[PDB]
From a paper:
E. coli aspartate aminotransferase (AAT) is a pyridoxal phosphate (PLP)-dependent enzyme that catalyses the reversible transamination of l-aspartate with α-ketoglutarate, yielding oxaloacetate and l-glutamate. During its catalytic cycle, AAT undergoes hinge movement to switch between an open conformation, in the ligand-free form, and a closed conformation upon association with substrates or inhibitors. Using our approach, we enrich the less populated but catalytically active closed conformation in order to increase catalytic efficiency (kcat/KM) with the non-native substrate l-phenylalanine, leading to altered substrate selectivity. Steady-state kinetics reveal kcat/KM increases of up to 100-fold towards this aromatic amino acid, resulting in a selectivity switch of up to 1900-fold, and structural analyses by room-temperature X-ray crystallography and multitemperature nuclear magnetic resonance (NMR) spectroscopy confirm that the conformational landscape is remodeled to favor the target state.
We collected X-ray diffraction data at room temperature (278 K) for all variants with the exception of AIFS, which could only be measured at cryogenic temperature (100 K) because we could only obtain small crystals that were not robust to radiation damage at non-cryogenic temperatures. All six enzymes yielded crystals under similar conditions, which could only be obtained in the presence of maleate, an inhibitor that stabilizes the closed conformation when bound by both WT25 and HEX14. In the inhibitor-bound state, all structures were closed as expected due to electrostatic interactions between maleate and the side chains of Arg280 and Arg374. Overlay of AAT structures (Chain A) in the presence and absence of maleate show transition from open to closed states upon inhibitor binding for WT, VFCS, and AIFS, but not for HEX, VFIT, and VFIY, which already adopt the closed conformation in the absence of bound inhibitor. Interestingly, the amplitude of the open/closed conformational transition that occurs in open variants upon maleate binding correlated with their computed ΔE values (VFCS < WT < AIFS), suggesting that this metric can be used to fine-tune this enzyme conformational landscape. OpenLow mutants had lower KM values and were more catalytically efficient than WT with both l-phenylalanine and l-aspartate, which could be due to the fact that these mutants have ΔE values similar to the WT but stabilize both the open and closed conformations by >10 kcal mol‒1.
Numbering used by the authors:
A (entry chain A), B (entry chain B): -2 to 396
Write the structure that this text describes.
Amino acid sequence: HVGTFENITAAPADPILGLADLFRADERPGKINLGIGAYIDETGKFPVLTSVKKAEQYLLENETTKSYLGIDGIPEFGRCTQELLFGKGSALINDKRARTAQTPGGTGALRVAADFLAKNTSVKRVWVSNPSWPNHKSVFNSAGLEVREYAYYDAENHTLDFDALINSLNEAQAGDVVLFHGCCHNPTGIDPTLEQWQTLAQLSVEKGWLPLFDFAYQGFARGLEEDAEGLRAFAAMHKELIVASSYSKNFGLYNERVGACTLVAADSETVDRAFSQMKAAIRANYSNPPAHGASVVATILSNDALRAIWEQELTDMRQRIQRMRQLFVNTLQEKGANRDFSFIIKQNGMFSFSGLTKEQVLRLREEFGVYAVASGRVNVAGMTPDNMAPLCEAIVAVL
Amino acid sequence: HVGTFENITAAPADPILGLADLFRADERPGKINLGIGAYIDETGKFPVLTSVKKAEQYLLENETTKSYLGIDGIPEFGRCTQELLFGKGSALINDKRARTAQTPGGTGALRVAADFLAKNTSVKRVWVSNPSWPNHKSVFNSAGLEVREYAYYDAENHTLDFDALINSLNEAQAGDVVLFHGCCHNPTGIDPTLEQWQTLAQLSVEKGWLPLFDFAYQGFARGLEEDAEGLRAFAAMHKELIVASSYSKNFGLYNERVGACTLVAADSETVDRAFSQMKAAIRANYSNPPAHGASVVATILSNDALRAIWEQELTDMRQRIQRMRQLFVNTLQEKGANRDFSFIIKQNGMFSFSGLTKEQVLRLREEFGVYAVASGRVNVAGMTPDNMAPLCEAIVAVL
Ligand SMILES: *Cc1c(COP(=O)(O)O)cnc(C)c1O
Ligand SMILES: *Cc1c(COP(=O)(O)O)cnc(C)c1O
């Protein structure tokens, strides 16, 4: 009998997560990792937050069971999630229009949404930005959903091409999903203004789209509440929406797989009925979600003192990234770049969408041991005072 | 615009995990939880193992990052998993024929395996025993695979009907998946003997089946090595197989979501090609797996002294369950059951597949606050010296 695996086609390594192994294997002295979006401190450590360590110490001392969570996870984690997303005292919360499942990361939340929609609704098409995080298409395609692209970035002026965005969504139909990044658009770092979010919310209602927000960076653009303004503008008028949120970056809990899928419907009866099918989709995937990271988040968000410690740590990360963004632009100039990189200062979040080409990114790896994503996305949150001059010399060398 | 969620049909609660909510809500102080397969201690707590607490205390004091694991998880976890499954020094390991991905539980490993097969092979169907764990059908169907049943249990005589099993599997075609429970068949507790496993392995090779092992209870039948004899009989002569294993029960790590998907192929080239697509399927599901529980497992298994503490705790659980199984049969007779319940002694694992009908299980809940699964499956590992008399009085009253 011919093996079942004989006809398999190899898949390439992931263009983002595969960079870790490539970086590790490189033997060039002075290599620099700017790939996966993870926060580094000034010393080059990707740290555990102090608030997280304190929560983990509390759990070690107080947990007396590991019994399965419910399919939707820890109830306090869901309550705190809805407050972060919508605001305490939101009508969505008071009217019991939203239900939240704790999931294994924001990716898990996107997947649970995809499987839920594919099995239980008439959704067949999801619109994502050009460019976007590459795993969006993979997640929705896994469920058999068609993924189209809408225009988003003006690569010439390094701004949002809002007129092309509007034009390109003209053919998005009622009952199609349109996916928006809540803040810190990945990879461009360019987000709608509040006025643009309000225009998009109105258009979405008029055209009957189902909005899906990917919210992986709440707190990294301007602050927790400011970064939710776009989502909240959508929440103010829509009957239905979905939010896939992540605590990987804003709590530094990447490998503990901490996210949430929040389903909003017109009323409590409808959301509860829909959520019962979301739970069935979870049960048939990974059964129930991992407790450790979500329990850390719930422990921090439900305790005023620990929460204040965490929100200061998040503000401190944002401040350091902003300082690196400015130092990067200045050092590129110092080291002889003639391209104007001032547009990088306007980008929000952890990255610089640099305009470097695929060929330049590959040269930076092969000739200089500097690792970025082939889309030109560079992790500013991985830069330090000690690595800045060599990384900028390398970039100037490939321009 | 009519809402996308307006016409969704509600899903029922899960027949196993839904018992957690029903039990927790019941106000009667005498309620007894015999539902989900979790181990209780004599004080009535579902505990954290001492080895696990020790490992968690080490992780708390020594972890310096939460950076993403690889898509396939912690390397030492995969090594230790292959050794448990196949034996240190197995030819499968020496010949580099096996690749392991850490997953969010055994369920996550089943779904990853099913998505991998549906999307990269000609597999269309999985053969599952009658009866089996109810979530098997849901996992496989959610990945797009048809599920067919093969004969297994003789419910009137409470035994494995091996001739009926082999006869029904003649309908399985080359390139179909056949699911086997590695040990502690859920729900019946009846496993093939070693000779029967060897017979099944030879037939599977001759017929071209792709074996998938669900191995959630290694250590709960007879012991770690003995419980893997059936899997190892398959590993001796198969070109290809898949193992979905779980550490939820044998480490008591239920809510940390700790399992593995292991692929075996004819040679290193083939298994590495296949595994590249398994990684792609993971990436598009939950991205990468949760570190905390798997870190605990790797810490325990890779330290000789801590491993010995854990293996004694696992033996102590298995022995207490055996004592409860023997006490349950006697107590049923003292409480007035006339019928033969000796078949319960022959069952391996956490459960007793009791022969109670759906109506009897519902009466147990409603009238006595005793919670079992509607199939008649009862969690012997939830029995204690203190709850045995009331649970047996309730059972006799509904017979
Ligand atoms: C970080 C990221 C994610 C996924 O996050 P996880 O929590 O690691 O699964 C999802 N979407 C975007 C846009 C991201 O940047
Ligand atoms: C325990 C169980 C599972 C699920 O295990 P998790 O690790 O919690 O996902 C899978 N299969 C069987 C047969 C089980 O009993």
